[PDB]
Design a protein around this ligand. Sequence first.
Ligand SMILES: Cc1cc2nc3c(=O)[nH]c(=O)nc-3n(C[C@H](O)[C@H](O)[C@H](O)COP(=O)(O)OP(=O)(O)OC[C@H]3O[C@@H](n4cnc5c(N)ncnc54)[C@H](O)[C@@H]3O)c2cc1C
Ligand SMILES: Cc1cc2nc3c(=O)[nH]c(=O)nc-3n(C[C@H](O)[C@H](O)[C@H](O)COP(=O)(O)OP(=O)(O)OC[C@H]3O[C@@H](n4cnc5c(N)ncnc54)[C@H](O)[C@@H]3O)c2cc1C
Lengths: 650, 176, 650
Amino acid sequence: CPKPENLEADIVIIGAGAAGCVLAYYLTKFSDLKIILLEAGHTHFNDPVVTDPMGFFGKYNPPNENIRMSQNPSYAWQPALEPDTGAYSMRNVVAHGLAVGGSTAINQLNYIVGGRTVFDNDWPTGWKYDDIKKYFRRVLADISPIRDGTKVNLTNTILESMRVLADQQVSSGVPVDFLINKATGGLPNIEQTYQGAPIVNLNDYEGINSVCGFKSYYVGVNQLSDGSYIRKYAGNTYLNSYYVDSNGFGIGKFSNLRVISDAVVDRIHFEGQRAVSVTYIDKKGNLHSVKVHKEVEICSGSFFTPTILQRSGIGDFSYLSSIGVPDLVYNNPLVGQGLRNHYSPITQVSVTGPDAAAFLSNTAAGPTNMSFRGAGMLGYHKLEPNKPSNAGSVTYRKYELLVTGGVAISADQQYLSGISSSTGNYFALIADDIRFAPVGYIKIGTPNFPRDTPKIFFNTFVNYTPTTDPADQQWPVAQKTLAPLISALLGYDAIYQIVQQMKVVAVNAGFNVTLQMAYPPNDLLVELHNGLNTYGINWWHYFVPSLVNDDTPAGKLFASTLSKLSYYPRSGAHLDSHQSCSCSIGGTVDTELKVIGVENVRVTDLSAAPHPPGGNTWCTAAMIGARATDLILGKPLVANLPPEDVPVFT
Amino acid sequence: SFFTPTILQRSGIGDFSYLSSIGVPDLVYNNPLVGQGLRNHYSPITQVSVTGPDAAAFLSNTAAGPTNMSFRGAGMLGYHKLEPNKPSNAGSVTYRKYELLVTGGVAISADQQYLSGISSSTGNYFALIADDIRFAPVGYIKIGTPNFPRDTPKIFFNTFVNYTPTTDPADQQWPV
Amino acid sequence: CPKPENLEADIVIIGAGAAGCVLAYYLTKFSDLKIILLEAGHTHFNDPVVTDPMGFFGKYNPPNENIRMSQNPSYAWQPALEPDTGAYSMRNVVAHGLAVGGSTAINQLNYIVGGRTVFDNDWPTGWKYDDIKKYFRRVLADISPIRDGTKVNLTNTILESMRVLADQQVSSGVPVDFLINKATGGLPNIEQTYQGAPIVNLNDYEGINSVCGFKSYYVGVNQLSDGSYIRKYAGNTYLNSYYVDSNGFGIGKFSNLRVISDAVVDRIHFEGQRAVSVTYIDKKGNLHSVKVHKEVEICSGSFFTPTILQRSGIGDFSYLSSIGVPDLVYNNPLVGQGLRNHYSPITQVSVTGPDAAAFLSNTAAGPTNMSFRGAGMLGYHKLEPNKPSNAGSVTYRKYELLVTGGVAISADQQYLSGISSSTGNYFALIADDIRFAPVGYIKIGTPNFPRDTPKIFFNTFVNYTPTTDPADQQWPVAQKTLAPLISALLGYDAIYQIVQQMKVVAVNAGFNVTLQMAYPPNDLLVELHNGLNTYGINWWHYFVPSLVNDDTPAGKLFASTLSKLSYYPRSGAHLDSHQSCSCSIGGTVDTELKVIGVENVRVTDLSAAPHPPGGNTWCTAAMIGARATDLILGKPLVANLPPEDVPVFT
Ligand SMILES: Cc1cc2nc3c(=O)[nH]c(=O)nc-3n(C[C@H](O)[C@H](O)[C@H](O)COP(=O)(O)OP(=O)(O)OC[C@H]3O[C@@H](n4cnc5c(N)ncnc54)[C@H](O)[C@@H]3O)c2cc1C
Ligand SMILES: Cc1cc2nc3c(=O)[nH]c(=O)nc-3n(C[C@H](O)[C@H](O)[C@H](O)COP(=O)(O)OP(=O)(O)OC[C@H]3O[C@@H](n4cnc5c(N)ncnc54)[C@H](O)[C@@H]3O)c2cc1C
């Protein structure tokens, strides 16, 4: 049976995403083992729409196919989730990149590293902050992001307003407002606003800043000697022409490395409890089998790691037998469970003034800010019942705030609201959830070949139906069910209570302008503010009006207002693309990242995270891959590599 | 419909430039029309309110059984009087345009249900559907990866597009 | 001496330009000989600035290096010609492309095939029109150009005017006006102007149209299924991924073909009168020697074919010995002699009217017209003394007319004239010379390595200095010396006498507008028109005022006007990039394209043309290469290949 594609080795890494390349690179650098990478994708080093950062916004799109890279089946997998019973049963498609570099070839390029507190309070032993912060330093040094290269006065006004009201939040003694950081003290952690003001680094090495108002992010772009920016991503850095031949061999130093471009993997041939081989389909349609000697690594992303595991034989035996899996290995009913993701409701602001163009200048997107102009990361609101115990003594990251010019609601909402993108006296504010509550799971549907869409369940904004139970002991399930909608409403109020300090700051900053939230409607926010400050910590009793027993017309007003307000976060919002926690630590893998019930396979992508980090989930996956390098190799080498040693660029 | 042109294109029949572009190694016949000319129906929905104290007597025996499957008529109609897009034979032959359907309850989508202020709980409401059988828009199908049959290939279908006027005199831009 | 780069074979083709790829492709297709191509250049299949046709105009240029491809030493050779004694001693740089596909990778993509009469009256035996027209059909079928995809009313107005005045030129019995074609008869050869008017094909198979007014050209672009156009050039078609491996091997059918990407050739190692080997420098800087068994082919372009010949040993023995050539083979004092090129003086038109934007719409450049909107090809003017004998019985192509929106004079001239490119009531007309008179030559300067700039002499608009000789028999050297300046002046008058028919046509075409030539100045053209029609065929006596002996103030007026007018074609013009005739037939090679004095080398690029064709010189070089395929192979195979057999595109 003459197949000369004998690619037997000792380590096989599957999926060259944000974590696959880091591992393959630093694994062939520090040892002599024979390494193989399989990705099922070519290298888009020459594509203008990839390498140019501004191509993300559709600059190179043919006029008849104006879709960008997340909606393009030639660039990204297209999985759709089953009807969201919390969002009027609207199915959604969220992508995972299909190329060297994974989703980093198609993403927005932001570098939130996540707070310090999360890795100290939500991760297992060995994964506390002080065990990994060095790895975060390693990756941010390997990329070297940059800051915004353009000033603007709107950032100054907004930072002014936030410090103004953080002054009061510092007083009044309440301990859990959203602008209090405990690692600084009485002084607010708000960046100064004047020429020669220093810059507060969000991703600081010692994690002092978990709540801070700044002016710019750190995007993963570099400037070339010519004057043009390009994209600096995982495949760009760790796997470029200098390190790997066009035929897939490494060069000299890394001669013990093999990369196959287009090879879709199906499952893991598995003798006993010992993985022994892997098969894949090349671009004819042939099945090639390769031996594994020493270990197998799975870096296939959040959606497609549990899936390949389940086809392999690890999962729920009853289910996999039901749908027709012939070979069964380990009976873990938790594989593909506990899926987590962020979520960002959207609001926009109207400015009334004859010459407000002077106010909104220098807001357009360049390859250094990518339309991001701030503003800060906030903590828990004062009136949110779902806070951990440590909230009295440690500050947690809850909301990530973003400001952007133009309007960003969906087109149907644009038409409905009466405000369009043509006019230029409008801008958008976003209060992202980082601690988003809902949880889902992933189930395969056919044991034949890797399918683009497996069963993915994710219900977010569900409702609570009261029972005949006495009110006293049914409240603490209403709390658990209504957490996310409460969080979104509190984000709305938090953004709302900024615009008045912004009014004052603009008035005495040389601007006769007026600021106002028009989406959601003005009245529907003033009423929420009044209801909050008149009903206190028991404001959220009124989501269910049959239990408050408050038949006063004021109570009916509050119930109706919350009913209407519950509509906006369902439709006028944007599910993010930060999928994580499919095979988390403890649930499916141990703290050394090995799969329970087997001795020589590990999962090391973002699916293995036991909690979503404090922001955009790119650094985290690379950190996990980097740490996996050490755990596989045995001794810390990437650990204290000097920071001046960085991969060369080509 | 969706997966015949796709297996053809992976096989080697299609647009040689495109299949070579995305990496098809073996090419057989150069037909640039494979996967072109996709057609489908489309059914806008409307619903009716009945006002009356004992209208339950009016709406009885409308529930779905395995013999009617919630269908209660009503007929198939031809072209409207005022539709400019009719074939030449319309003067001498009758064409099928609309398929009419009546059904109890409400059938708009849930978000529209909330928006309109009328829900499915109440029982003095029913739905009428005027389906298009001669639906105009046309699309096409293109594969995206020459490896294995994928669930989602590139499918393009734009229905209710709009017309943007040009500086051309009005007289000879109407028939586009 | 261990050099494993043993690339000994029987045919070696040097330079993959507009003629190298055609030959290599169709030569490995129809035989079994071992073929090698050397180009010294990589393949720009992925570069956006190359493949996108609109990239020619600088759409992908970094803001700090805004130069396009002809001025870029990484894309094109940069030879500069010695001071032009006719153009105020202004040196000029004209480029030859440096890539697979040669100048076709950087050109404007036009497909004039040239008239029929030229190949019948100016080429040797065996190269008359009916011997090659099939080869022209072959190349135009191999490319499949397209037409303009956008109407415009300016083309209709101009064609209207030309037919109006061609009506009169048909009458009055004069035989040599510029709008008379003899293969049609009394009816003008002017394309009809209304909806459903047929299209006159300029490049018609039987060559009936040598003078004709049309509306669109044939550019070498294709439309992709997506909606984006790309560039279809020599390397794109004959040497693409489907035919050649990334390692330079051919595939299956063409397995007997080798292509080396970056290999600069120096000279031809030459045993006896028999070429035996060739050396080249790779991208280390190493010298690799390859054996030749059977024949050597030179396709290195107009500027660099005679140069490599001279370094090889063929040329003027005294000169090559003088500058230090050690090995001398054949003493041909004509190598590198007889250089020819086109030349296009420029004029622009002002339109006065309140709403002339309605007149000039739909003139912007798209990848189908590339800013070309006509207009036609004309013959000799009535009053040009330098016409061949056959002018009474055959119509010759003299001027190629072009219309374009915006202004195209050089920047210094823009400032001088007081009219800039910002304003939008102005457009350009160009009367190109196809029969341009001046001739030059090429001489190497150092026998070490191929140099970018060898001695290139080209003097165009020289002046005549009278002697003491009696006037009677010194006129017919003044004629020969003043030919090109006379031609340019007559082109000016020809364009001038169009604008009044354009006035009438616009007046009764629904337009209240006014047309006027502002560059060169209005008065300086009206005076030329009056002088022409008052002095007749002896209008050109007045270039030299010391011989006319006409001291009348009218004669002084005429002399001064011609003196001033002689300034514009010198500076306000554009030397084209159609270099040809360096090793023409008879001068340096026989009719079977072999080099005199040697048995197994040929030159087959555009340098071997014994006359410049009737238009843009791209089809001609490809035709020469195609015919060379037959002469080398011996029997006509590419001759009657069916036109439905075309190279597949990837
Ligand atoms: C639309 C979008 C927006 C984003 N925005 C941001 C942002 O603002 N900030 C930020 O920091 N990050 C952003 N990201 C990136 C994202 O948050 C993380 O970078 C992502 O989780 C990367 O983690 P990963 O490497 O584990 O996943 P991936 O990069 O998806 O790794 C999966 C890899 O495995 C391959 N693979 C999958 N299945 C198979 C199989 N069967 N066989 C072989 N190979 C396979 C895939 O092709 C891919 O190369 C965005 C991503 C997207 C898609
Ligand atoms: C600015 C510009 C504008 C043009 N505009 C038009 C137009 O409007 N219409 C039109 O029809 N054509 C146009 N052309 C194209 C031009 O008129 C012809 O296509 C050209 O003569 C091609 O002929 P060729 O193949 O013999 O020359 P080339 O294409 O130049 O062939 C020479 C080849 O040999 C290689 N070579 C040279 N020296 C060496 C060496 N020492 N060793 C190895 N390789 C070597 C070169 O890199 C190149 O690949 C334009 C070209 C340019 C540069």
